[PDB]
Every structure is written in C-alpha cells, then in structure tokens.
C-alpha cells in the first residue's frame, strides 16, 4: 500500500523547553529513511510524533499520512517498534508469535490463516532456524539479542504495516548482527515496498551506505534532508569538510554537535490463559518454592507425628501453623505478578490485543489452578502421618477450607500489588497486613482489649483458623467427654457458615479491589 | 618510570580451543597502544595475559616487562582497570578515593600524603567539579557513567603505575563522553610519560586518530602491528582497500572478520569500618524496614495493651512473637550481605587492600552496631504499654536477652549466606532452618516425640524463649501463689545460664563458621 508520509513545520514545546522548531521531510514507499541525531537531541520525540504516540496541545503542525489527517484508520498501517523488547521469557518464538497473531489480527478470519501469517514473518525476518528454542531473558538460556529484536519487529509485522517506525533497533548488539538486521529492514523497503523509518544511534560504515534517505537534526532544526549518498555533497557545497578519514555518519553527528461480543471475550481469555501458562508454572512450581513446602511438610509431619487429638493445645498450634504458612506464602508470591508485567500489559493493551478485563481474568483464573497444587500436596502428606481426624469428609473439608484460604489470601497479594505497583514497596505492606492478620487470628492473644476486636473480623487468618478447628473438633461437645480451657479457644466465636461466607467475600472482594486498582494504569 | 613491554610468540591452549597462536608487539613509554579486535576474538585474553592476571601452564612465551621475568616486583607498576566498575553506592567520590588511598598505598607514609595522592588524581582525571556528589548506582541518584569509569581508573592510579592496562573503558557510554575519556588516557601517555594499553570495542573517527599504536588481531595471529596512522598504508601495500568511505577502525574490524603487624590490622579494620558505614545504615535503616518494625511495635503494643501478668498464656505468646519476629528479621537481612559484595571483595583482596580477616571482622563489628537500634526501639516502646515486669533490672535483662538473640540469629544469616553464596538459594534455607527453630522453640509443640528432642537444643529460638519467660515469670514459684499447666511451659527445661552460654556459643560459633565458609572464595 502506498504510504507517502510528509510533515510541514513540526513544533514541540514540552515542559518551557523547545524541542522541534522544525522538522520537514518526505518519506516514500521505497525510501528507507534513517533519522540520525546526537544523544537526547530530537530522535525519539520525532518518532513518537510521526507514529502518533504523542499528541495533544504540545504537537503543532500537520503530520499528514498520504495527505490525510491522523485518525486511527491511518494507524492500522502503523506498527511502531519500541526500543525495549517486552517478551514472555518462557514461550518459544513459534509460541511468542502465534499467540500475538491470534490476539491482534482481526477476529473475522480462520485459525490457520492466523497461523500462517505468523509462519510467513518467521521465515521472512530470519528466525526459521532458531524457531524451536525458548526466547528467554538474562537468566533463562534463550535466543540472541539480535534475534530478540527480530521477534519484536514481527510483533508489528502482523497488522501488515506499510509504515514501519523502528526506534533504535541497533542499540545493544553486535557489528555483524546489527549489519544483517538492517538489510532485512532495507529489504522490506526495497523488496516489499514498505516505508521504513528508523533511528540508528551510531551506525557503521556499511550501515550508512545501506540507508536510502538520511534526515538529520542537530537539536531540532533539521540540518540535512536528503539522500545519505548525497550527504557529503551538500556540506562541502556549504563549507564543511572532514579533515581526516571518517565514517560519513560520524562526520555528521559531531557537526550536529558543532564539532569540526461475548465470544470475542471468552477466546481472548482462552488465548491469554494458554499464553500465560508457562509463566504460571515457573512461578508456582519454582524449585525453591517446592523445597519451601517439601521442607514444611516434613517439619510439620515429624514434630506432630502420630499426634493424639486429646492434646488439644498441640492441635491448635498445628491448625495455626497451617493457617500461618498458607496465608503468608500465597499472599507473598502474589504481590509480584502485576508489577512484573506492567510494561507488557500497557503496550499490548494500547495495540488492541485485549482490554484489561480479559487480561485480569486470565491472571485470576490462571492462578486459581497452579496455586492449588502445593497446598493440596502438603495437606495430603501431613494428614495421615500427623493423625488428624480420620474420614474422607473431615479430610476433604480440611482441603476445601485450606484451598479456599490459599485463594482468599492470594487475593490480598493481587490487591496490594495492583494498588501499589512497586514490587518491594507492596511486599512490605503485604507482610505488615499479614502480621496484623496472624496476631488477631485468635491464637496468640485470647484476652484482646476492647478496641482491637474489629481487627479480627477483617482478618483472613481468623476465619481459616476458626474453620480448621471446627472441622477437627467441632462445637466442642465431645472432647469434654474425653477430657472429663476449650470454650475460650474451641467454641465461642463466629460460626461455620459465616466463616465460609466471608472467606468468599474476601475471595471475590479482593479481586474486585485488584481490578479497580488496575484501572488508572 | 620507563616500562618497555614487549612479548615474543604468546600462546594459549584453553579448554582444546586455540586462542593465541601468536602475539608479538612493542609498547613504549609514550605509545598509547589500542588493541582492536572483533567480538570474543582475543582482546581481553591478551590483556589479562599481559597484566599477569592469568598464568599457569596455559600461558607459553615470554611476557617480559623491561626485559624482565614477571614477578610481583614487576606488578606494583601494573594497574589493570577491569571492565565492571565495583564501587560502593553511597560514598562520595572524595570518600571513594580517599578510603582506597589509605588501604592500597604503602603504610609507611603519613595520613595527609595519602590524602593528597587521592586529591591529585581527582583533579587529574577530571572529577573535580563532581567531587561532592554521591557515586550511586542504577537506583541511587549519582554520578554519570563516564565519571564512574574515571573513579575506577583512579583506583589504579594510586599505586602510581607506569603500565596502565584498561579493559574496554568506552563500552557503555556516550560519544562526547567516551571522546573526553580517551584524551585523558592519551594525556597520560603524552603528558605524563605513562605506558597505556587499552582495548576499545568499536571506536569513532576521532578516537582512532587519537591512538598512537594499533595492535590488531583477527582471531589470534596479529594481523597489524604498528601505528594507526600507518594502518591504511600497510594494507593497500598488500592488497586490501576500502571501496567506500569508512572510519579507519571499521575498515579493519571486518577485515579481521574477513569481510571486504598488629597495628596494620587494627587500622585496616578501622578504615573498612568507616568506609562500610553508609552501607550499613542503608541496610539497617531502610525506610521499609523501619516501617516493618514501627508497624510491629503498634500491633504488638495494641493487641497486648495493658496486659495482666496473671494471664500466663497471653504472655507466653507475647514472648514467642518477640522470639519469632527478632529471629526471622535479623536472620533474613543478614543473608544478602556477603553475596552483594563478593565482586568487590575478590578484586580488592587481590590488589593487596586487605586479607579477608580485617574484611570479615569489619562486617561483624559493623553489623553489631546498626542491627541493635531497631530491636532496642521496639522493646522500649512495647514494654511500658504492654505492661511487662516493671523494674529496670527485668527491663535491661529483657533487652540484653533480645539484643543477644538478635545477634545470635544474625550470625545464622552470615553463616548461610557465606556457605551458599547465592542470595536467593540461601534465602530459602535460612527460612527453612528458621522454620525448624520456631516449631521446636517450645511453644507450638509441648509433647515433642522421642526423636525430635535433639532439634530443640540446636534451635536459637528455644534459648531466647526460655530466657524471656524466666525473666518475666522466673522458676515459677510465685505465679502459682497468684493463680492458686505452668510447669510444662514455664519451669522445667535448661537453665538460665545454660541458655546464655549457648546463645554466646551460637554467637561466636556462627561467625567462625561464616569465616570458614568464606575461605575457599
């Protein structure tokens, strides 16, 4: 598609600092424009004003694409590639590119044509022989730093753009790998007729002879406009010449210095639940978190080994250690989930992949399945060695109360990690609040003063501890017959169905508060 | 001092992969040699073999400095600057450079001549106008990334070297800031007569006309040896010429590819205690750790507010929450101290700054002072509102047992963070071990089975909990007169002087084990 983007007299008056007291230039369907500039001058600010990302009263002037006003009809052929590559570190580059193909292509299509649009751009950007390996990151062994940039170009080569605005794709990799990355970017403009605009930070010699047009600014007044072939011939015609052998870009960069709709949702949920699945079995099934529960299963199962139910005080410290360990450990690991993906969510929600309702419910329903495997293997091991109340009905009620308490405490981490978006500023308040939940849980203090008894009814550990006792002992009423004390500890408080009906109001109410916390982001 | 370093026929047969089937060249007191090579070729391996860092049967050939065999007499004039700048993020660059001046200069000198040798190289490397600002890191607001490299050159410009071997000082900063960094490195060879050898990763045009000699290898067979001025004239005399305008380094890098004694110790302890002091008030006085104890002082002081000592079971959960909170929080923050400084210690111990006995005891004696401020302000607040045993003698014994338990538990973190040098693999075992210390502390289980009673005598929380009760209640013997049960909980166990004499054997014995853990690093 023909995209002839030109822009007359671009202005910028950011916080008052002047940025562009200028800009003008033409790009063409076949002109690989490279925007060259010094550090912090005008490079990325022009790119976001060209690609429509920044707007408002700060922008002045016409940014006409195909001599047409910027609306979002003119933004389906855009495809701005940002500098930081935000990928999920466990998906294969097949999986990274098919899951974005099902998400950001139009829905009125087939599963297989949105499987071959993602298989075309995998053998077009040179990812075909690394296509079975994990993406990874600085920890997980994965693809290269040049191949990580090729995936993020394919994230925008799926809306089929004619205007492709890369923002420094060469900053951070090799010389023989940022060479091959540009002839692919030049091959899209020469061999496919696209209109590529890039901003190389500092080129090489055979990266500058690969640019079609070079638009160069000093600090916002567009010194050169024209072909980079003809870049020298303009300045010796005006009065500046290199006095020693230079790469032609490096001669101009210091001269810039001056030195010389229901089915739509439930499949968006299904794609975001299968994409975000290896991310939810690396959190929940971490080998240090498996060892933190395998060790807590042997310590709890040897210190309370073959325990008698007549020792009532030994049991109430077993059902409060269980209420401590599964209200601290789920609520702590749930505070990092939303800060770790605020960068990936904010980019992909803006590119029309989802709408934060199907993203939040893919984090809720994806963590209601992996967080229930380790407490269900803890309480299976430490019920028939610890000798709790025998019978499938007291066992499955101990499981149903623990697995509801694990999820009701996990929602406290999701609500605090979303209100406070820092992963360490909210990791403190989630241990301060869980300290006020254990102290008022009814085990350490029994003579609570008149004025701190409203703090136990909002506690999450209170309702699990009152339920774990009432399954094992009951309403009292028979341990007294076997003991011949246990009414201040075992009997007199909120009931059994008020302690389930608030652990469901703390289940749902902490995820409604988490979603309302993620609503000004 | 005249350093004429040349080396004939350098070999390398690392793990078998051949690296150098070559090397030969001359540097001179005035020749700023720049070693140019492609990615991973031979660059840093030659630099460590020149500077003497790597040795053994792998090195073959003569590395003669001033036609002399490499001994450590010939290593006081070395001064290899490594690539990663390991600085302390809270010291000012005055403080960063005076504390290394007192440490690595010879001791037979004065305090002020080792204050002016550090004040000379601060107005020589261009650090004079940023000299009152913090170094910082990626979090703390500090000096630039070009000024951080200037401090690490001044770390080696204090032994007064004539041979200065930098290992890529330009990799990771600007174009107008890695320009100024090289004329200082060229000004040391031109204006001060030093013998500088560097390895620039990818130069600019006016960085290559600033090199005196360029020694260039493809993959270990030394393609060019000679002046970088005469770098072109050698290759068009042999058959290779650029077919388009190139920076002269960039023409040669792809042609490399093929594309065309007691007082000594106690002042070393005193310098390492005043250097490592802002590092120990940023850990201990973190605003999230202050809030984690201010919140635990109000929750403990409102749930147990105006409590009666006749409620014996409410007190034993107050003296076990104190034994939990001050055995978990010191032992957790002490596991990160040694992994966070393994890079800074291993470099500075090798450059003769200290010898790991004065480094370890500066971490011990520097954490015995800052870790005692927050438990002493906790137990001051929650003793006269919680109404514990009145009297200065039960108060100061409650303080002396807590502050001894804080340090005896802190030594568990120092011993596990040093045996397991990972900050997260040892953060799991320090919460697994502190879980086996709370369960066997004598509060949750009283009917411990025959076979798990050896696990309470190695517990740290046991000896603090048995001491905190015995200060508040005693040997029983009077609460029975006021109550008209408390012999299974309050009386019958190890004594009061066996519970102090093991919390001192766990104080000293966990720091001897930590030092023996830091002895194969």
From Swiss-Prot, chains A, B:
Disulfide bonds: none annotated. The chain crosses the membrane at residues 261-273, 285-305, 316-336, 368-388, 401-421, 426-446, 490-510. Gene3D superfamilies: P-loop containing nucleotide triphosphate hydrolases. Pfam families: ABC2_membrane (PF01061), ABC2_membrane_7 (PF19055), ABC_tran (PF00005). High affinity abscisic acid (ABA) transporter that mediates the export of ABA, with a preference for (+)-ABA, through the plasma membrane, especially in vascular tissues (e.g. phloem companion cells), and is involved in the intercellular ABA signaling pathway. Together with ABCG31, export ABA from the endosperm to deliver it to the embryo via ABCG30 and ABCG40-mediated import to suppress radicle extension and subsequent embryonic growth. This is ABC transporter G family member 25. Residues 267-473 form the ABC transmembrane type-2 domain. The gene is ABCG25. GO terms for cellular component: plasma membrane. Residues 16-244 form the ABC transporter domain. Mainly expressed in vascular tissues,predominantly in phloem companion cells, with highest levels in roots and seeds, and lower levels in seedlings, stems, leaves and flowers. Mostly observed in inflorescence meristems relative to cauline leaves and developing siliques. In seeds, mainly expressed in the endosperm and, to a lesser extent, in the embryo. SUPFAM superfamilies: P-loop containing nucleoside triphosphate hydrolases. It is found in: Cell membrane. Induction: By abscisic acid (ABA). In cauline leaves, activated by cold stress, but repressed by heat stress. Within inflorescence meristems, down-regulated by both cold and heat stress treatments. In developing siliques, activated by cold stress, but unaffected by heat stress. Keywords: Abscisic acid signaling pathway, ATP-binding, Cell membrane, Glycoprotein, Membrane, Nucleotide-binding, Stress response, Transmembrane, Transmembrane helix, Transport. SMART domains: AAA. Disruption phenotype: Hypersensitivity to abscisic acid (ABA). ATP binds at residues 37-44. It is a multi-pass membrane protein. It comes from Arabidopsis thaliana.
């Amino acid at each position: 598609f023909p995209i002839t983007l030109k822009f007359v007299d671009v202005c910028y008056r950011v916080k008052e600092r002047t940025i562009l007291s200028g800009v003008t230039g033409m790009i063409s369907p076949g002109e690989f424009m490279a925007v060259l500039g010094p550090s912090g001058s005008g490079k990325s600010t022009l790119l976001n004003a060209v690609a429509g990302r920044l707007h408002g009263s700060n922008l002045t002037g016409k940014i006409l694409i195909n001599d047409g006003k910027i609306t979002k009809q003119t933004l389906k052929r855009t495809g701005f590639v940002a500098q930081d590559d935000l990928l999920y570190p466990h998906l294969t580059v097949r999986e990274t590119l098919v899951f974005v193909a099902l998400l950001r292509l139009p829905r009125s299509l087939t599963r297989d044509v949105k499987l071959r649009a993602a298989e075309s751009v995998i053998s077009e950007l040179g990812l075909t022989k690394c296509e079975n390996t994990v993406v990874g990151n600085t920890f997980i062994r994965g693809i290269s730093g040049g191949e990580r940039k090729r995936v993020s170009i394919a994230h925008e080569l799926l809306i089929n753009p004619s205007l492709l605005v890369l923002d420094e794709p060469t900053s951070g990799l090799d010389a023989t790998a940022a060479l091959r990355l540009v002839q692919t970017l030049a091959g899209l403009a020469h061999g496919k007729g696209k209109t590529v605009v890039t901003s190389i930070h500092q080129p090489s010699s055979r990266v500058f002879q690969m640019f079609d047009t070079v638009l160069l600014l000093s600090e916002g007044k567009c010194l050169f406009v024209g072909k980079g072939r003809d870049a020298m011939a303009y300045f010796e015609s005006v009065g500046f010449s290199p006095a020693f052998p230079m790469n032609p870009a490096d001669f101009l960069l210091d001269l810039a210095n001056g030195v010389c709709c229901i089915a739509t949702w439930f499949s968006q949920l299904c794609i975001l639940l299968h994409r975000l699945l290896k991310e939810r079995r690396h959190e929940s099934f971490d080998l240090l978190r498996i060892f933190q529960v395998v060790a807590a299963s042997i310590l709890c199962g040897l210190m309370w080994w073959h325990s008698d139910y007549r020792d009532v005080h030994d049991r109430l410290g077993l059902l409060f250690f269980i209420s401590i360990f599964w209200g601290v450990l789920p609520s702590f690991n749930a505070v990092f989930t939303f800060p770790q993906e605020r960068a990936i969510f904010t980019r992909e929600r803006a590119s029309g992949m989802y709408t934060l309702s199907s993203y939040f419910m893919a984090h809720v329903l994806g963590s209601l399945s992996m967080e229930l495997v380790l407490p269900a293997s803890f309480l299976t091991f430490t019920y028939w060695m610890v000798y709790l109340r025998p019978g499938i009905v007291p066992f499955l009620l101990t499981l149903s109360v623990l697995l509801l308490y694990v999820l009701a405490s996990q929602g406290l981490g999701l609500a605090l990690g979303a209100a406070i978006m820092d992963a360490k500023k909210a990791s403190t308040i989630v241990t301060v609040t869980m300290l006020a939940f254990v102290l008022t849980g009814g085990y350490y203090v029994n003579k609570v003063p008149s004025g701190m008894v409203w703090m136990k009814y909002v506690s999450t550990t209170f309702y699990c501890y009152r339920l774990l006792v009432a399954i094992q002992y009951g309403s009292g009423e028979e341990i007294l017959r076997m003991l011949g004390f246990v009414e201040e500890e075992v009997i007199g408080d909120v009931g059994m169905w008020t302690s389930v009906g608030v652990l469901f109001l703390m289940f749902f109410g902490y995820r409604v508060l988490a979603y309302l916390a993620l609503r000004r982001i």
